[PDB]
Amino acid sequence: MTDSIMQNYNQLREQVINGDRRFQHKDGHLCFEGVDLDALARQYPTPFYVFSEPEIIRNIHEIQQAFAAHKNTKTFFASKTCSVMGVLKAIRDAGICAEANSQYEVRKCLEIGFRGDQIVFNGVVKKPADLEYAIANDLYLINVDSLYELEHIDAISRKLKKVANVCVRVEPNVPVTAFHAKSGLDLEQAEETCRRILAMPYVHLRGLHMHVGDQVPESEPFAKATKVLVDESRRLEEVLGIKFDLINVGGGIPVPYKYDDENGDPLKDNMYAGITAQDFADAVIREVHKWRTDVEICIEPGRKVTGSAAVLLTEVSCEKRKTNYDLNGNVECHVEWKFVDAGYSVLSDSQHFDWFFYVYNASRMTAAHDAWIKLAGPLCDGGDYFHMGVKGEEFLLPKETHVGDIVAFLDAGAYTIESQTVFNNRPRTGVVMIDKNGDTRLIRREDSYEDMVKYDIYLAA
Amino acid sequence: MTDSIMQNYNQLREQVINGDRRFQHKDGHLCFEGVDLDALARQYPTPFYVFSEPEIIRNIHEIQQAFAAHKNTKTFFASKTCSVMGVLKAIRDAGICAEANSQYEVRKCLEIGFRGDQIVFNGVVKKPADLEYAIANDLYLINVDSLYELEHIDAISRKLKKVANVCVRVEPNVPVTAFHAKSGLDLEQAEETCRRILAMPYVHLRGLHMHVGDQVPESEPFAKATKVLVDESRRLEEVLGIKFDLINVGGGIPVPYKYDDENGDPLKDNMYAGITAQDFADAVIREVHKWRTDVEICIEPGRKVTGSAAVLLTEVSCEKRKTNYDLNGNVECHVEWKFVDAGYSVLSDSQHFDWFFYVYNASRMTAAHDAWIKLAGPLCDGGDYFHMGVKGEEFLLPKETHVGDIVAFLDAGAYTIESQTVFNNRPRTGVVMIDKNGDTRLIRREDSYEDMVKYDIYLAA
Ligand SMILES: [Cl-]
Ligand SMILES: [Cl-]
Ligand SMILES: [K+]
Ligand SMILES: [K+]
Known part of the structure; x- marks a missing residue:
């Protein structure tokens, strides 16, 4: 009817x-x-x-409470989601960090009061001018998305005599990644990329990075992808004789756009949220703790903070x-x-x-x-x-x-x-x-x- | 292969x-x-x-030459297509008029040098402030899209003591218009709407208006829709005892985005242009001339001018x-x-x-x-x-x-x-x-x- x-x-x-x-x-x-x-x-x-600043705060609380089992969790709001300065200010005042997606996003996050050590800069096209600005501002992380870009990071960090802090983005083939995923390196490239960074005088390797997607209606993609990143982190610690500072598992926590879950199938209509922040955290934390309980976990929720x-x-x-x-x-x-x-x-x-x-x-x-x-x-x-x-x-x-x-x-x-x-x-x-x-x-x-x-x-x- | x-x-x-x-x-x-x-x-x-100003000029020439069989043709560039001021200036200097789709479009067309008598203002949401600005600027046409809007046109033209020049938009059901076409009045509403305008002291009825769509790959839709508008124009001249100034047949001339027409079906892939400006003009002119050869035909090409x-x-x-x-x-x-x-x-x-x-x-x-x-x-x-x-x-x-x-x-x-x-x-x-x-x-x-x-x-x- x-x-x-x-x-x-x-x-x-x-x-x-x-x-x-x-x-x-x-x-x-x-x-x-x-x-x-x-x-x-x-x-x-x-x-x-x-x-609503009150609802932003409630959403951040859901996210942080979800990670209660892992003390060393750092939360970076994906500011592509919304970067109106008063929205960023509410997020900064609620006590979390910021992820940025262009030179001007980095700049506005600094302007509104996020410190360099509270900013991750990600991208597939980080031109020399973008990288120079980021490195000069002592960002917590700049991701490494390609070998071509890495050469600019090496050259510019040397020129500035300032250490660039990096995480290597690896996009796992979880059953087609080569055809549908423009971002990140292949798993097979992670070892040599990390080895090369270790030898650079002004680049500091902090860990690996991935990001699964947006409005993800199931926990399995996060668990499987995190396991790939964790297994390679563990393996590289052994092979290279290092201890990673962190692992960055990205964003993708969904938000309910339809609320009558009894009438919805999230796998067919992802306006139904298929999972909660707690489900996301359970998947991520469980996989990371099979490797280390002390390592920092970085997350990059966007939609869930403000949606x-x-x-x-x-x-x-x-x-x-x-x-x-x-x-x-x-x-x-x-x-x-x-x-x-x-x-x-x-x-x-x-x-x-x-x-x-x-x-x-x-x-x-x-x-x-x-x-x-x-x-x-x-x-x-x-x-x-x-x-x-x-x-x-x-x-x-x-x-x-x-x-x-x-x-x-x-x-x-x-x-x-x-x-x-x-x-x-x-x-x-x-x-x-x-x-x-x-x-x-x-x-x-x-x-x-x-x-x-x-x-x-x-x-x- | x-x-x-x-x-x-x-x-x-x-x-x-x-x-x-x-x-x-x-x-x-x-x-x-x-x-x-x-x-x-x-x-x-x-x-x-x-x-390229030269190519804009060549496109305008195609359009105007297509209408050679009808001397009293007026061409209004649909400025939603591109309203960068230097683009509008090139179009004004090439000798045609302008169609506008908001109060600020009207204003920028006036600013760049289109006269009021060279501007059509169309819309489904023309608020009192929009209508007051348009009427005060003596526009060539303001379309009438609904009975609700018409009441504002009557009241505001009376307040300003300035004649509002109008064309009544009628969207024909050409085999679902009620469900898929938000714009215009039903054919069945045209007579009473025109009768009421005739009685308003400060509204001048100039004719009827339609617009078929965008990147249209066949001539038949234009011919059939134009015939509906022409037949109703002829009928209303008789019933109401008037002579219309014009008929406005809208835009929709396609542009080739793929050029190897021998390999394309425009009805399946409308990146192939299914028709030329000459085909559009032949369809429109043939239908209008079954009623009158002297009436002004207004056209509103957008994409074809600059694409x-x-x-x-x-x-x-x-x-x-x-x-x-x-x-x-x-x-x-x-x-x-x-x-x-x-x-x-x-x-x-x-x-x-x-x-x-x-x-x-x-x-x-x-x-x-x-x-x-x-x-x-x-x-x-x-x-x-x-x-x-x-x-x-x-x-x-x-x-x-x-x-x-x-x-x-x-x-x-x-x-x-x-x-x-x-x-x-x-x-x-x-x-x-x-x-x-x-x-x-x-x-x-x-x-x-x-x-x-x-x-x-x-x-x-
Ligand atoms: Cl944090
Ligand atoms: Cl003209
Ligand atoms: K190093
Ligand atoms: K009148």
Whole structure:
């Protein structure tokens, strides 16, 4: 039944407002950490993202508590996930470290107050200028992704007379890695690469690195890949006569985007989280401890830190009914279109990666969501509507939904800011933060008109 | 054979440098309008796009010549395709008009020198502020996309005491429109919508509008949809006792992304252009002339104006070989990975829309492209490699390819600039223009570090 789908969705809605650590209701409205989101969306122009420092902290706690059995664990937030400076500041103040994915990511992490010894710099294209900047800033780790890059690390560390601290990335063939994995070295190359680093005067080998993937719905991939890295670490300690400082096992802890696990198969629909942080930690720690209990384990969670910790707020800005008629002029069906002021230039993964986010009427959060609608964005593009619905391409909202109501997309905190575009010269969005005291502030402005053209060089008028 | 695929690709390569109006060779390098692109990519940091004003002009000529049988044709470049100010200036100087897709697009078109009477403003979400700005600027057309929006057009035109010039967008059900087309009104709503506009004191009804789609590989959709709009225009002239100024038939003229038409089926692979501008014009004009030969026809080409008129230049910045071994340690296959400094944050449609672009070694353009390689970008994302290869996910480059060589992606002028992101805080690219005299200048800067953080509000260090 669609009645059953509708019943289930309204049970989920009730659980948001009565059963979720993040949310409440007041005045008929969805609240996030006590902040009425209808009211918030009248103080700031839509569309915008609102982050929760309290929920970031809760997510970091899940991660760190998961690793309680291994004291020497170091946690580096994968800042490609979200690098708005106030988001990075909340993460730094919560007591963890940072992983960076470009020269400018390294620089902004340093600027917001991560120390060099709290930063890992990873990449497949680390040009001489990138490596010089990283080495000059005494980073905790720079990964070694290829033999070509390693030659630049040797030459530049020598030039600067500064030790480059490295981890060698090895991507295991776990049953095709050569064809589908661009990153890292082959297992077969690890020994000679490590031997060569040991002989370099200004490069310090700290350990091996891997990263399995993103939104991983099973523990086995982590266990099998970690075992490969652990076995090679153990073997190289013996062969080379060294003791590694660490092992870096990467990220990939999933986040629930659908919550009714009893109705989902995570291996078929990875919007269902197939595993928890505790499952990830159990797999990793168990494998590492077969080698050493004292070695440092570095992890690089991205999505899990911020994914659940933001909402996208977008105003219903237009509506229409489209009707299909048969050849005799009789109605075949009606479609109720609701247009919000955010499209895929604002929420890119909803279009490009078939990503599901819960959608509710934040202005009518206590009302039955009892009408099937299609949800469109504002871009001049027939494809700019939200295809990942509750049932096919259809969403559920109260039949009473009105232009002016605020729609919320939940779990909108990972990979949603830097992926925005200025397609159609709609601006990239502002971003608001709810701090630990429940107070709000703007942490990113909406792009202005000046910002659309300030990059261009042209004869003025 | 893959030998046959390789032979065919090298025949295409030879045709680029001996048989293409845009390109030549010099010093072993690809040249665009006489500009050596290897040399250009040493003067400006990669990756960057280079546009050709001469090729934009040639494309506009194709379009306008296609409409020679209808004198009263007005051509509006769909500026969502590319709105870098120097690109818009070239289009304005070539003598055509502009279609705009947001308030800021309208504003930049006015700023670069399109007059109000040369601008169409389209949209599904035209908020009061957008409509007020458009009406105040005396635009040639503002489309009417819904009854809800029309109420704002009436109220705001009355407030300003300024006539709003409109075209009513009608999306025909051509064998599901209600379910798949968010834009426009139903045919069945056109009569009453027009009747109501006629009665408004400050709204001027000019005609009907449609837009079929993008990269359309057959003429029939245009002919059938145009006939629907023409038949309803004729009928409403009679019923309402009026004479329409115009009919706006939209865009969608395709561009060839693969050129060996003898080997392609455009209905299965629409990288093959299934039709030319002349085919589009023949379909449209034939249908309009069954009603009136004097009425103005408005067209809204986007992709066809700029698609063929840019190249993305990107340096080979790293390389590696990955090898799959069997359980006995014997080699199963090798993969030669070449890493360029542009990934899907720079060339978004290569990832998100399965878009093919020809790829050549611009530094070795006269050398046989005789080695199968995989082409990766620089993002820290396993999916950031180019999947739309010559054969599956494999490309062809000279075996002699070296780090430092410049790779060119052809046909990179449509939907490639505003769709860029700062994912991983890699900057959005600079843009260079080759003018009519063959001289180059920077028309957009690369985003600087300041630009990564200038939008953020945070406590300084
Ligand atoms: Cl830590
Ligand atoms: Cl014109
Ligand atoms: K060493
Ligand atoms: K009127």
